Design a binder for this molecule. Structure first.
Ligand SMILES: *[C@@H]1O[C@H](CO)[C@@H](O)[C@H](O)[C@H]1NC(C)=O
Ligand SMILES: *[C@H]1O[C@H](CO)[C@@H](O)[C@H](O)[C@H]1NC(C)=O
Ligand SMILES: [Ca+2]
Length: 276
């Protein structure tokens, strides 16, 4: 029948930092068109909260909305008569699922107690969850109150990808992250023979096998008497230094040849004895 006011939106809810504008149409012939913050102050223009007034509409733009922004805004018109209609819009500022400062290739040592870390958060407290394939909860895996999952005896097969999924049932909002898990495993030397034997002056020869086990794969360095063993014409090592061949053994070559195997998770050393 008579004067009335409308707004582009009625109920909006945006993340923090998000921006948006609303338009207030005043169907009629208003002399007055004014906005009001949820505090009841007649909005004045600021380059972050801007108010543009044209014709019979009025646009209110909120840039990078913070938390002091939520509330019931009101556009309110007034003609030459005392008639004074208004429309209102409800703004809700919230927090998207954030995953701040969350490193991946997370490394852990074979035996230790691992805690895979996922720093995730949202306005209504997120509902986090850990997946491997697919869910997980096997009396060795458990989610701490801080959202991280722990693995008590992080065996190396445990090594893999883990999804830290998070949902906000209040918004049907979901988002995950995929973390890589690395199981560092100290070196484990393996050499079937640690006691060899050739004949002196005769141009005999002997190869010495030393294999290891670890993640990363261990580096095998040999030592003799007190010096690192280099190749030379005397010794020839091939299989990434897993096979030490001593050429032209005399009497002086008899005795321990020590085998070192190293990685970032420790070291193992075993030696062979060469009898002449
Ligand atoms: C050569 O040395 C090994 C050391 O394990 C020993 O068992 C073996 O008896 C030796 N060979 C001979 C023919 O004695
Ligand atoms: C689990 O698998 C890894 C594979 O590298 C191995 O290191 C570990 O010994 C295994 N543990 C069990 C329970 O068999
Ligand atoms: Ca923006």
């Amino acid at each position: 029948a008579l004067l009335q006011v409308t707004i582009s939106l009625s109920k909006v809810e945006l993340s923090v930092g998000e921006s948006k504008f609303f338009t207030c149409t005043a169907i009629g012939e208003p002399e007055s068109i004014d906005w009001y913050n949820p505090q009841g102050e007649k909005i004045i223009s600021t380059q972050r909260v801007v108010v543009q007034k044209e014709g019979v509409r009025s646009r209110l733009t909120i840039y990078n909305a913070n938390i002091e922004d939520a509330g019931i805004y009101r556009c309110q018109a007034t003609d030459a008569k005392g008639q004074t209609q208004e429309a209102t819009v409800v703004l809700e500022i919230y927090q998207k699922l954030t995953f701040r400062e969350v490193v991946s290739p997370q490394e852990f040592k074979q035996g230790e107690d691992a805690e895979v870390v996922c720093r995730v958060s949202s306005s209504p407290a997120p509902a986090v969850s850990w997946l491997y394939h697919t869910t997980i909860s096997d009396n060795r895996f458990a989610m701490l109150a801080n959202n991280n999952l722990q693995i008590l005896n992080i065996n190396k097969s445990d090594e893999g990808i883990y999804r830290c999924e998070g949902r906000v049932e209040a918004r049907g909002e979901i988002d995950f992250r995929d973390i890589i898990v690395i199981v560092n495993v100290p070196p484990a030397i393996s050499m079937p023979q640690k006691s060899f034997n050739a004949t002196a002056e005769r141009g005999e020869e002997m190869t010495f096998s030393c294999r290891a086990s670890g993640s990363p794969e261990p580096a095998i360095s040999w030592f003799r008497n007190g010096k690192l063993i280099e190749e030379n014409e005397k010794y020839i090592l091939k299989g990434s230094n897993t096979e030490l061949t001593v050429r032209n053994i005399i009497n002086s070559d008899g005795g321990p040849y020590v085998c070192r195997a190293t990685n970032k998770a420790g070291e193992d050393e075993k030696q062979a004895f060469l009898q002449v």
